[PDB]
Structure formats: structure tokens, C-alpha cells
Design a protein that fits this description.
The structure is a homodimer. By secondary structure, chain A is an alpha+beta fold. Chain A is 21% helix and 17% strand. Chain A is built from 7 helices and 10 strands. In chain A, helix 1 crosses helix 4 and helix 2 packs across helix 3. The longest helix of chain A has 17 residues. The termini of chain A are far apart. In chain A, 49% of the residues are buried. The interface between A and B is large, with 64 and 64 residues. The complex binds the ligand CN1C(=O)c2ccccc2NC(=O)/C1=C/c1ccccc1 (2 copies), bromide ion (BR) (4 copies) and nickel (II) ion (2 copies). Chains A, B: Homodimer. Chains A, B: Pathway: Secondary metabolite biosynthesis; Alkaloid biosynthesis; Mycotoxin biosynthesis.
């Protein structure tokens, strides 16, 4: 059976329950084609200048991504569409509050544009977070997902051009002896569609077989505010931060965070006061 | 049997193994009396002006600490002794690298001075982190400690003035039906001595019974860089940050972090590069 397909607006309340059951769901029209176009246009040059993932120039090289792959993260200062439209997505926030209510506040662990070159091979079948957060491997098998990944198509996803593989139900697997490409189904998607998986869903980028098509995706890893993001917004100019909504500011770590603990004492606080109150951080100040 | 006592220098290699076994150890002369004096002098006025933990002025009130208790965190900008001597402690870093090698890099989840007033009651027997990090309750019972707490005496700890209670072995308890003050032993300490416990050690602040003595402690919660600190250093002036060692900068979250994953892709990175490389962050620049 195939990855369940849900409408971003009509089926909103069904999205997280579907992922909790099956470990995957396709959100049709997660982003409008307008947002997809502006995002592609804004990140285009940064993709072109990005060195290889394991460049000797980098002090945090990525030795896992294929050398032909390009990843651009810290999108807030690059993309108006990302920092305004994506970070304030009603669909994303409903899904995240549904997913993470047991833990408390959530934020962006990483928002990255990934461009896969022609003839890019399939990734090995994997769970995310194993190269950054060893702690998640020590969680009880029954523990609610501490992170989820929105794999948004910025170009068409086909079986030919290397659409994502997922094993439905694999987010509940403890025994991994039945892990095989034979057990996978494909995430066929138009630009603006999003494949939503958990940190436990076994999946992989597909093989590019046309030899001509460049595939591009926006991967948004949303995680509980108790987990450290893969990316930092510390160097993002304060003027850009002060142009955002308070919600967007929290997602970039430019605000204090709260746990779901009845008498929560909070995260990233300053002597009982928030970052935003302390620093007198303004919001929605146009550039 | 009593809390094991170890010399900060002669017994350095024994400190973490002792805590892993017994859930507690007293580090004799963790800080020199010189450092204790300078720390007390530098934080003195900030303790006096600090409102009640649950002050209506605060947007992150602490509803758990007794109203007479005073907690001052984000000590880097207050205290030269803290930011230079404590953050670069050879003993602290050996213990933390011993404790957290399985996870990777560690940093300060919170460094706070706590002053307990005369007639302060004993805290309820508890494990730390339950009002900030619900995630730790979902870790497997056998999981290595993801945070440890250095309870440094800034004044004498006596049975009379409310010295810490610990239950030895309680860090390995799953069944909590034998939890009682009857099962506790006391951390009797001179200023500069430190009681080291894990996030699973069952313990409590003791009752102040003299009715005259003010008790003061420096609580340093050290945790894996994968967990979000209780406190933020985002508002600490860049000049103060650039006066620190690179190690101290990492502990305050003003640097990228690494996991122990063989092909680690890192935490708080910027397109494959560190915070410190990206922002051209200087170190050991005297004010
Ligand atoms: C290494 N790696 C990434 O870089 C990555 C990239 C974008 C978003 C999340 C992310 N995290 C991962 O766990 C990851 C998995 C992965 C596994 C196998 C093959 C290629 C990737
Ligand atoms: C609430 N609370 C704190 O505020 C606190 C203070 C300093 C350092 C860590 C810390 N974290 C806690 O878990 C904590 C425990 C706690 C429990 C029972 C009674 C009083 C405290
Ligand atoms: Br790849
Ligand atoms: Br993919
Ligand atoms: Br208290
Ligand atoms: Br105490
Ligand atoms: Ni993946
Ligand atoms: Ni405690």
C-alpha cells in the first residue's frame, strides 16, 4: 500500500495522526507554487557557490552526502519567502503542536535546501539524527518522536529522478532484519508537496536514473526545543531577526523556550526573564 | 555508608567512576578559597537585588523554589572568577569528558549562585531536569547520564544549616517505593568543596535548623551539547565573550558543538562551518 495523501487545508487535523500510524504522509500543496518560485529564486545563487559537502575548507565537513550533492542551511538571511511564509506556515505549526504537545515548545533543528545532481545514487536506508544526536538512540522504543522532517519538493519528485523511498510502519520497528528496498514505497510529488516523516521512519533519497534531471528539496527538521539545532542563527543580523514574527524568532532560537512540565522553569532564560524581554527584541519591524 | 570523598588533584581519575557507581562523590577543594572569595564578592549585589523566584515581574517564574531562596544565573557577565577560573577548571573538564565521551561535546546547562535564607525548609527528594527537560524521562533506564550537577559550597555545608541529602545508588533505581529521608546521607562540605551528582541521583537541599545561618552554593549543571541549556548567554556583550578561552566560549554556546558519532555532522553549524570561524570570533582578548 502507498504513502497516504492529505490536503494541507481540508485534511489538516488528519496529518499528524496519519504519520503517527504509518510513519509517513504526503501533504499536497504544503507550500503554494508562488512560495516555491520565490524560494528557488532566492537560494539559486547560494546553491551554485556552495562547495562539496566534505570540502577541506570546512571545519564541519559532511562525509555522508554524495560529493555532487549541495546543501544550503541558515536560510533566514538568504530567503524572505522562508523567514516570512515558511516559518509562519499554519499547517507546519498545527502539525508540530499536534506532534510535540507531550514535550512542549518546538523549533527548527535544520531548514536546508538540498540539490541532487543528475545520476545521484540512492542514499542507504536510514533514520535521521544519527550523525548529530546520539541521545535519540537511547530513548525508549515507545517514546514519542522528538523530531519530524518535512521533505518539501522544490522540483518534481518522480520514480525516475530519485523520489524519496519510505518503509511504512518502520518508525515502530525495533528488529531491523526486514530492512530492504523491497519493503519501500515512493513519495511521488509536485513542487510544493511535502513528505512528512519522523526521526524513526526508515527512508532514503532515491537513485537519479534519467541522467539529465536536477532534483531540489527543502528539508525542514522540526524538533522539541530541548534538542540542540544542527544549524545556528547566532550570526543572522539583528535587523533581519527583528523583521520576523515572535513565532519565527522562537523557531530560530532568538527567544526563550518552554517545556510541557506543569511547573516548567523554561529553556534559554535569563534570571527568570526571556531572551526577548531581556534584549528588548522587536518583532515585525520591516527592513 | 557515607558519600565518598576524593581530592580534586590526587584522586582526579577516580571522581567520575565513583559517581557512576554510587551516584554521588564530594570533590575536596574543587575551587580554591581565593576563587570562592572572588565569586562571592562579584555575585553579592546581584543576590541582594534578585526578586523572589516566582516574581510577577518575571515571564519565566520558578514556582518550585521557596520564596525566600534567591537564584542568580548567566554568571559570565557578572563574575571574572566564573568566566575565567570556573569555566576553564581542569578537574571539571576531565570529569565531564569522562562522563560524556559516549555522547560527544558538553556545555553549561546552567551555572547559578543559590542563596538559602535562615529557616529554609528541606526540598522534596527529587531528580533534577524534570521541570525543563521532559525528554530525559523517556531515556532507557540503562542510558548513560546526559547531565551532571556540581553543587559547590560557597559557604559551609553542615547538618544544622541544611547540607544536601543524597540516596547513594538511587541513580540506578527504577522502583522508587523505598524513597525516604531515612535512606539519605549528608554532604558536609567546606567552602570550595563540590558535591557531584547525576540527573538520576535522588537528593534534596536540607532544612536550615539554626535559624541564623545563610547557606550559599554554586550549582553547575554540565550536560551534552545535544540538550538545550536552562539559561541563555545570547545577551552577553561580544567583548566579554571575546575575553574568554575557546573552551569557555563553547560552554556558553558561543561555538559549534560535535557529537561522538563516527561521521559527526555537528551542532549549531553554518553551511559546514563553525560559529567561531563564520563570525571571526576572537578568544582571550583582554577587556
Ligand atoms: C547525513 N545526514 C544529513 O546530512 C542530513 C541532511 C539534511 C537533513 C538532515 C540530515 N541528517 C541526517 O541524519 C543525514 C542523514 C543521511 C543518511 C544517509 C545518507 C545521507 C544523509
Ligand atoms: C526546580 N529546580 C530548579 O530550579 C533548579 C535550580 C538550580 C539548578 C537546577 C534546577 N533544576 C531543577 O530541576 C530544580 C529542582 C528542584 C526540585 C525540588 C525543589 C527545588 C528544586
Ligand atoms: Br546525497
Ligand atoms: Br529525498
Ligand atoms: Br529552595
Ligand atoms: Br543543596
Ligand atoms: Ni534522511
Ligand atoms: Ni536538585
Amino acid at each position: 500500500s502507498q504513502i497516504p495523501r492529505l490536503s494541507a487545508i481540508n485534511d489538516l487535523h488528519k496529518i499528524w495522526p496519519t504519520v503517527e500510524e504509518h510513519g509517513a504522509a504526503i501533504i499536497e500543496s504544503f507550500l503554494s507554487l508562488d512560495i516555491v518560485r520565490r524560494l528557488n529564486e532566492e537560494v539559486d545563487p547560494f546553491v551554485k557557490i556552495e562547495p562539496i559537502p566534505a570540502a577541506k575548507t570546512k571545519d564541519h565537513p559532511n562525509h555522508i552526502l554524495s560529493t555532487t550533492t549541495r546543501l544550503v542551511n541558515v536560510l533566514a538571511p538568504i530567503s524572505k519567502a522562508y523567514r516570512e511564509d515558511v516559518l509562519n506556515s499554519k499547517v507546519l505549526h498545527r502539525i508540530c503542536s499536534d506532534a510535540f504537545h507531550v514535550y512542549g515548545d518546538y523549533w527548527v533543528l535544520m531548514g536546508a535546501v538540498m540539490e541532487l545532481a543528475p545520476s545521484n545514487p540512492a542514499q542507504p536506508l536510514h533514520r535521521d539524527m544519527r550523525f548529530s544526536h546520539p541521545i535519540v538512540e537511547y530513548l525508549k522504543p515507545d517514546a514519542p518522536a522528538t523530531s519530524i522532517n518535512f521533505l518539501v519538493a522544490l522540483s518534481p519528485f518522480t520514480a525516475e529522478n530519485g523520489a524519496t523511498h519510505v518503509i511504512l510502519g518502520s518508525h515502530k520497528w525495533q528488529n531491523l532484519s526486514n530492512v530492504s528496498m523491497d519493503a519501500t514505497v515512493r513519495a511521488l510529488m509536485n513542487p510544493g508537496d511535502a513528505l512528512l516523516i519522523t526521526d524513526s521512519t526508515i527512508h532514503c533519497g532515491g537513485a537519479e536514473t534519467t541522467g539529465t534531471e536536477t532534483r531540489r528539496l527543502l528539508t525542514i527538521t522540526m524538533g522539541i526545543s530541548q534538542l540542540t539545532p544542527l544549524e545556528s542563527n547566532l550570526a543572522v543580523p539583528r535587523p533581519v531577526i527583528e523583521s520576523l514574527t515572535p513565532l519565527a524568532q522562537r523557531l530560530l532560537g532568538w527567544a526563550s523556550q518552554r517545556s510541557a512540565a506543569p511547573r516548567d522553569i523554561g529553556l534559554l532564560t535569563i534570571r527568570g526573564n526571556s531572551i526577548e524581554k531581556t534584549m528588548n527584541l522587536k518583532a515585525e519591524q520591516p527592513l
